């Protein structure tokens, strides 16, 4: 992150914040738990309660992303209702506002739909995180077997070196040594390859959602241009709205840029 | 939106979907209400229960966005925990994975922080939506007075034209006519100006969040390049990690592009 | 401070830590309040209980440094006892150890004495912090008078513009305006000059204590050179100690460098 050289928690303002000062904190700071009700919070402790020690963190990790999915499902679905209600209010308004508002509802509807595709790809990233969780949890019992083996041979050797079980326990240590070694190496291999692929796919989904979000946001700015802000005095009639086809053409250009999106092209060019 | 010429609900695939087929639907389709618990749903009906008829839709609208804010608050805060837990797991892994993972946790932390600023600006857009709700709700009683006036004069005229209250009720109709006319005109004025300003600011916040999201996503892709996917065979040691400063420099370029973001420049260029 | 680009609290190791790994955390983590008993903690809240609002932070600040002084008084005095007890143990040991140990006790005694001078200068810095506290606390009642004045004139003007007290209250606002302005300007002046002088003197005391600490520490390292670590086998006598004058001369050089310390010279040369 970006932080200032001060004991204060507040960081240095961004160049974007220089032009527009940051708004006051949101008035939705509920005086409650604030973390996806109670069942999710109790579930969070349950992952580390009765799971393998090695995979306890991963058992939380994959399921924690389910909390991301469930919360984002509400965001996508409930914001979808906002587009429903927004375009509905356009009726009890003048024609110019009605056309702009319901068109904005279409654009927000697209915002929600793209979000839903993002949650689907997010689920796929969660699924492969579950897969690496599964193999790591399968590795753990071998570690259990190995430490049990060295514990027994150490205890038996301490008791007496003439025990007949130590000749076979020494080979059992070598047994488990090669046993654990082969899949410890592939555990690093599969973790590296799967994490790289999963997060490359996840960031690909993030880039897809991000650029689509930006394209609709900018074209909504162009859509908002057909919104007269003239302060008409009372007693005088309004000229009739005429930008019906102009807003219609704006959507067509939006759809044209929507259906012509390939990963080869990218307006965002990191340095 | 984009839909195909078919009675089927499924739409035509996007060019992005042509390269990568869409993933299967998420496994988080809970068999429950699925809309921000029950209190929000019961609250949604309450807005239209005991409110002014004109502002019933707006009373829902501004408060519905509070449901967006509350749900997004969970998303921002609970995904923030995912960055916490992800970087924590980097300990019980090789050094290369540890450096990449905790750096990814930093980038996701920035993702959450930018989300929080988005919710703050979203609250401001909700607040001005509350303001237009307030004035429209203040307009409603005049409509109540006007229809009551014409109802009384019509009923009195039907009963008898010689009633002494009709001479003053006729002027009362003109009274309320000019009364309602002046602020009906400004109601259209303030609704148009405030909606345009609020949604221009909201789309400005959306563009800000979108481009910042994309910048961090792309630089995370560059960060992921320092992740060897070589399938090392068991029994052979690994060369030591060396991309400590390379990943450090990647963040510096990310911060440099982060602190040098102005609305004058925009990589996204709509056609 | 120096922190790493990770959500982990642990920072990047220093170059000094690279040569010598950091030791495990101290075993003195008492399961108690741990902040200078209870009276100091209760006193800390008392400073902000019944004090002027403007000087509440400074009233804590100057007195908080008394907590530094009281705690450092214990450190200086109780470590002074450690030098007493250390040199005492030198009796029931061989002559070589006895000479080295009691000489080390002398050096630690000097360590304590220099600490005491540091606490004295620390008290002076605390005293001038009390002085700026006093003047700022004296400024506060004028702010009280000014806001009371504007409150009364606003309330009286709201009640009626014909009130006879408003003609004199308007001049009273100008009265307090020039009143507050003259010492607000000097408040900034005196705060800047006094804080600069106090912390320059405080850092001068810190530099004095620091370099004296280092000089005694290094000469103690030279003193420790007269300490044979040979593993003498049992049954063989030891050669008699002879470095009596060598350790005596080491102290003389230490005292010679001690009495020849001027602020013009400084081994520490910041870049």
Q: Please tell me if residue B254 touches chain C, with a CB cutoff of 8 Å.
A: no
If you count residue pairs, one on B and one on C, with CB atoms under 8 Å apart, how many are there? 21
CA distances to B144, B153, B215 from B173, in Å:
12, 9, 61
> Which DSSP string do the residues of chain A spell out, in sequence order?
----SSSSSPPPPPHHHHHSPPPPPPTT--SS--SSTTHHHHHHHHHTTSS-STTHHHHHHHHHHHHHHHHHHHHHHHHHHHHHHHHHHGGGS-HHHHHHHHHHHHHHHHHHHHHHHHHHHHHHHHHHHHHHHHHHHHHHHHHHHHHHHHHHHHHHHHH-TT-THHHHHHHHHHHHHHHHHHHHHHHHHHHHHHHHHHHHHHHHHHHHHHHHHHHHHHHHHHHHTS-----PPTT-PPPPP-THHHHHHHHHHHHHHHHT--TT--S----
Q: Measuring CA to CA, which residue among C69, C64, C60, C68 is closest to residue C120?
A: C69
Nearest-Cα distance to chain A for B245, in Å, is: 17
Using CA atoms, how far apart are residues B57 and A92, in angstroms rounded to an integer? 10
Q: Are residues C97 and C191 in contact, defined by beta-carbon separation less than 8 angstroms?
A: no
- The two three-digit tokens of residue A102, written as one number: 């319901």
CA A187-A192-A193 angle, 5° bins: 105
Measured between alpha carbons, how far is B10 from B27 in angstroms, rounded to an integer?
A: 19
Residue B154: count of CB within 10 angstroms of its CB = 11
Q: Which of C169, B261, B106 is nearest to A271 (CA)?
A: B261
CB atoms within 10 A of CB A215: 22
The answer to whether A16 contacts chain B (CB < 8 Å) is: yes
Residue C53 and residue B168: Cα distance in Å, rounded?
62
Would an 8 Å CB–CB cutoff place C5 in contact with chain B?
yes
What per-residue string of b and e applies to C111-133 under the rule 16 or more CB within 10 Å gives b?
bbebbeebbebbeebbebbbebb
Mutation pick from A111, A137, A218 vs chain B, by most beta carbons of B within 10 Å, is: A218
Q: Any chain B CB within 8 A of the CB of A167?
A: no
- H/E run at residue C127: helix C95-159
The 3-state DSSP class for residue C63 equals helix
B199 part of contact set with chain C, CB < 8 Å: no
3-class secondary structure per residue, chain B: CCCCCCCCCCCCCCHHHHHCCCCCCCCCCCCCCCCCCCHHHHHHHHHCCCCCCCCHHHHHHHHHHHHHHHHHHHHHHHHHHHHHHHHHHHHHCCHHHHHHHHHHHHHHHHHHHHHHHHHHHHHHHHHHHHHHHHHHHHHHHHHHHHHHHHHHHHHHHHHCCCCCHHHHHHHHHHHHHHHHHHHHHHHHHHHHHHHHHHHHHHHHHHHHHHHHHHHHHHHHHHHHCCCCCCCCCCCCCCCCCCCHHHHHHHHHHHHHHHHCCCCCCCCCCCC
Q: How far apart, in whole angstroms, are the C-alpha atoms of residue B133 and residue B61?
A: 9
**Could you say which of B102, B248, B251 has the minimum Cβ distance to residue C8?**
B102
Let me know the angle formed at the C-alpha of C144 by C140 and C147, rounded to the nearest 5 degrees. 135
How distant is the Cα of A156 from the closest Cα of chain B, in angstroms?
29
Contacts of A194 in chain B (CB under 8 A): none
Q: How many residues in chain B?
A: 271
Interface contact B105, partner C, CB < 8 A: yes
DSSP secondary-structure letter at C249?
A: H
Q: How far is CA A177 from CA A47, A150, A152, A153, in A?
A: 30, 11, 15, 14
């Amino acid at each position: 992150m970006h932080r200032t050289y001060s004991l204060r928690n507040q960081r240095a303002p961004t160049a974007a914040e220089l032009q527009a000062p940051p708004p006051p904190p949101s008035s939705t700071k509920s005086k409650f738990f604030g973390k996806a009700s109670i069942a999710s919070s109790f579930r969070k402790n349950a992952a580390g309660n009765f799971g393998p020690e090695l995979a306890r963190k991963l058992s939380q990790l994959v399921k924690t992303e389910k909390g991301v999915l469930r919360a984002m499902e509400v965001v996508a679905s409930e914001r979808r209702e906002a587009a429903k209600q927004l375009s509905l209010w356009g009726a009890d308004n003048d024609d110019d506002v009605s056309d702009v508002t319901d068109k904005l509802g279409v654009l927000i509807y697209e915002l929600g739909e793209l979000q839903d595709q993002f949650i689907d790809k997010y689920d796929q990233y969660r699924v492969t995180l579950k897969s690496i969780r599964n193999i790591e949890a399968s590795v753990q019992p071998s570690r259990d077997r190995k430490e049990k083996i060295t514990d027994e041979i150490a205890h038996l050797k301490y008791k007496d070196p003439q025990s007949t079980k130590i000749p076979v326990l020494e080979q059992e240590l070598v047994r488990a040594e090669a046993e654990s070694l082969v899949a410890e190496a592939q555990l690093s291999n599969i973790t590296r390859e799967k994490l790289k692929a999963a997060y490359s796919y996840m960031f690909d989904s993030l880039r897809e959602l991000s650029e689509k979000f930006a394209l609709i946001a900018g074209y909504g700015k162009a859509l908002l241009e057909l919104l007269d802000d003239s302060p008409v005095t009372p007693g005088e009639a309004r000229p009739a709205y005429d930008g019906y086809e102009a807003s219609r053409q704006i959507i067509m250009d939006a759809e044209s840029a929507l259906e012509s999106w390939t990963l080869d092209m990218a307006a965002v060019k990191p340095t």
